[PDB]
Design a protein around this ligand. Structure first.
Ligand code: EDT
Ligand code: CL
Ligand code: FE
Length: 498
C-alpha cells in the first residue's frame, strides 16, 4: 500500500489532550492540533489558523484575524470563541505551565467576533508568537470535546483542525492515524500512518531489517548508532543525519559537595575527552559541544572560551583547590573526604549507561571517583526536581525553545537547571536577568542580558557540555527524502512525498 507507512515510537502517542504533557507525545499532538501561527526554520512565524494580527503600541494587547474556512475534523467550526475557550482551558491549569512564561503573561483572551481574537499580556513578551507556535499547550481542540467545560481533567475525542486524525490507539501495541480528508490546508500524500510501540532501540533496528516498519525518525537514541552507521552503507536502505538540533550535557550540582566548588566543576569540564566519548559511545555520529548552546543558537554566539580535554589542567585545578592524592591512592582527598561524585541516569538507557561509564573512567584518570546511579525514569525525574544529584544527564530543547524557553525554565524550582544552579551566589541575579530578557523591548539590552546569563553559566561551569546531537532517519528507499520539521519535537509526516 504505497500511501500507507508503518513507523515506530518507544511509547504510545497518549490520549492526545492538546493541553497536557506526558504521556502525550508532542509530535502526535502537532499532527492533530494546530497553532495560530506556524514556526519557520529562520525563527519567524507565518500565518496559520490566524491569517493576520496587530499589537498595541505598548505591546501588551494583540488582535488575531482568524481564518473563516476551518472546521475541526468532527465538522464543528474553528472560530474565535473556540480559540478563546481553548486559552481559558489551558490557563485554568496555569500552575502546570510555569515553565512557559507566556502562560504567566496572558492576562486575558476573548473573542471580539467569530474571526477576531484579542490576547492581553502582563508585559511586552518578545517570544509571544514563537510560544503560540509550540506543539503545546496553545493548540485547539473542539470545545465540544472538553470534559465538564475543562481539558485539565481530560478530554473526550481528540478532535483537532490538523491534517491527521487519530483512528485508534491500543496501549503498548500501536496508534493509527489517517489523513484528515476535510483539512483546510493541503492534504498529505500519505493516507495512513501506523506507530508500532517498540520501546527497545535494538528491537526497533530489527523491526526495520525484517520489513515490519518502513521508517524510523528520532534523536541519537532512535537505534544503536553502530547499526545506524551500518545501515548508512547498506544499499537496500535510506538513512539521514540532520544538522545538530540541541545539546546533551551534564548538570553539575552547585549546591552539593564536591560540585559546590567552582574549581571542581572547572576540573570536571577539562576531564572528559568528548571526541573520544562520541567516537566510542556515539560511534562518531554526533558533534562535540563546548558550550550549553551551540554558537549557531540565537543570541549564543558569544565567543565563550571552551574547556578542551586537558587532564593535566584538571589535576592542577584540583591540586590548587586542596584535592590531593594520598600515598599510593587514585582518588583525591581534602580534609580526609574523598573526591566522590554521584552520576545519576536512567539505568535501562544503554547509551546513557555507556556515556556514564566513559565519564567515570576519564574522571578517575584525574582523581575523581564517580559513582554510577542507574535508576528507573521516575526516580531520575524525582532527583532532577528536588536536586538529589551530583551530576545528571540533561539536554536543551531545540528550536524554538533554545535559548529563551530553556532559560525561562531555569527559574522554576522543580526543574534540573534551577536545582543545579541553586548554590550560585549570582542565582538571584541570573533569575532576575532571565525575567528581564524575556520582557525587554530594547534589543541592545536583550543581547547584553543573554550575554550576561550565558557567560555566568559558562564561567560558573554549571554544565559539562558533551554533544550537539542530530535527528536521524532510517527508511525504505521508496519513501524518498524525509524532511525535518523546524520544531525539533515535531515530525513532518505531511511533507513525506514518495
Ligand atoms: O515535559 C514537560 O512536562 C515540560 N517540559 C517543558 C519543555 N519541553 C516542552 C514540552 O514538554 O512541552 C521541551 C521538551 O519536552 O522537549 C519540561 C521538560 O521537558 O524538561
Ligand atoms: Cl542510540
Ligand atoms: Fe517537555
Amino acid at each position: 500500500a504505497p500511501d500507507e507507512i508503518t513507523t515506530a515510537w518507544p511509547v504510545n502517542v497518549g490520549p492526545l489532550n492538546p493541553h497536557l504533557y506526558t504521556p502525550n507525545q508532542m509530535f502526535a499532538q502537532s499532527m492533530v492540533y494546530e497553532p495560530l501561527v506556524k514556526y519557520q526554520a529562520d525563527g519567524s512565524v507565518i500565518p496559520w489558523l490566524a491569517k493576520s494580527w496587530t499589537h498595541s503600541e505598548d505591546g501588551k494587547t494583540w488582535t488575531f484575524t482568524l481564518r473563516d474556512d476551518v472546521k475541526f475534523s468532527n465538522g464543528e467550526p474553528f472560530d474565535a470563541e473556540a480559540a478563546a475557550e481553548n486559552f481559558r482551558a489551558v490557563l485554568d491549569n496555569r500552575q502546570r505551565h510555569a515553565w512557559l512564561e507566556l502562560a504567566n503573561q496572558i492576562v486575558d483572551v476573548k473573542a471580539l467576533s467569530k474571526t477576531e481574537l484579542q490576547i492581553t499580556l502582563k508585559s511586552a513578551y518578545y517570544p509571544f508568537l514563537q510560544e503560540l507556535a509550540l506543539p503545546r499547550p496553545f493548540r485547539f481542540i473542539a470545545p465540544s470535546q472538553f470534559k465538564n467545560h475543562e481539558t485539565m481533567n481530560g478530554i473526550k475525542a481528540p478532535i483537532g483542525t490538523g491534517p491527521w486524525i487519530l483512528q485508534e490507539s491500543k496501549l503498548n501495541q500501536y496508534d493509527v492515524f489517517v489523513r484528515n480528508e476535510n483539512y483546510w490546508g493541503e492534504k498529505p500524500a500519505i493516507k495512513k500512518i501506523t506507530f508500532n510501540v517498540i520501546p527497545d532501540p535494538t528491537t526497533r533496528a530489527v523491526a526495520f531489517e525484517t520489513g515490519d516498519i518502513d521508517l524510523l525518525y528520532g534523536n541519537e537514541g532512535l537505534l544503536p548508532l553502530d547499526t545506524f552507521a551500518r545501515f548508512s552503507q547498506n544499499p537496500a536502505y535510506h538513512t539521514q543525519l540532520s544538522q545538530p538540533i540541541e545539546t546533551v550535557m551534564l548538570a553539575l550540582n552547585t549546591a552539593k559537595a564536591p560540585t559546590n566548588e567552582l574549581a571542581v566543576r572547572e576540573a570536571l569540564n577539562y576531564a572528559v575527552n568528548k571526541k573520544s566519548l562520541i567516537d566510542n559511545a556515539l560511534y562518531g555520529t554526533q558533534q562535540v559541544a563546548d558550550t550549553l548552546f551551540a554558537p549557531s543558537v540565537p543570541y549564543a554566539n558569544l565567543g565563550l572560551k571552551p574547556s578542551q580535554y586537558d587532564p593535566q589542567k584538571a589535576k592542577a585545578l584540583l591540586e590548587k583547590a586542596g584535592w590531593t592524592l594520598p600515598a599510593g591512592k587514585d582518588i583525591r582527598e581534602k580534609n580526609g573526604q574523598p573526591l566522590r561524585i554521584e552520576l545519576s541516569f536512567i539505568g535501562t538507557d544503554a547509551l546513557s549507561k555507556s556515556m556514564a561509564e566513559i565519564i567515570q573512567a576519564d574522571m578517575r584518570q584525574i582523581g575523581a571517583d564517580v559513582s554510577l546511579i542507574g535508576e528507573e525514569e521516575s526516580s531520575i525525574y524525582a532527583r532532577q526536581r528536588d536536586g538529589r544529584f551530583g551530576m545528571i544527564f540533561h539536554r536543551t530543547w531545540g528550536a524554538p525553545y533554545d535559548p529563551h524557553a530553556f532559560l525561562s525554565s531555569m527559574r522554576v524550582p522543580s526543574h534540573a537547571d534551577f536545582q543545579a544552579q541553586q548554590g550560585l551566589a549570582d542565582k538571584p541575579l541570573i533569575d532576575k536577568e532571565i525575567g528581564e530578557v524575556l520582557a525587554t523591548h530594547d534589543e541592545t539590552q536583550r543581547q547584553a542580558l543573554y550575554r550576561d546569563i550565558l557567560t555566568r553559566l559558562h564561567d560558573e561551569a554549571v554544565y559539562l557540555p558533551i554533544s550537539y546531537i542530530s535527528m536521524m532517519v532510517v527508511s525504505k528507499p521508496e519513501l524518498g527524502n524525509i524532511p525535518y520539521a523546524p520544531i525539533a519535537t515535531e515530525i513532518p509526516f505531511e511533507q513525506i512525498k514518495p
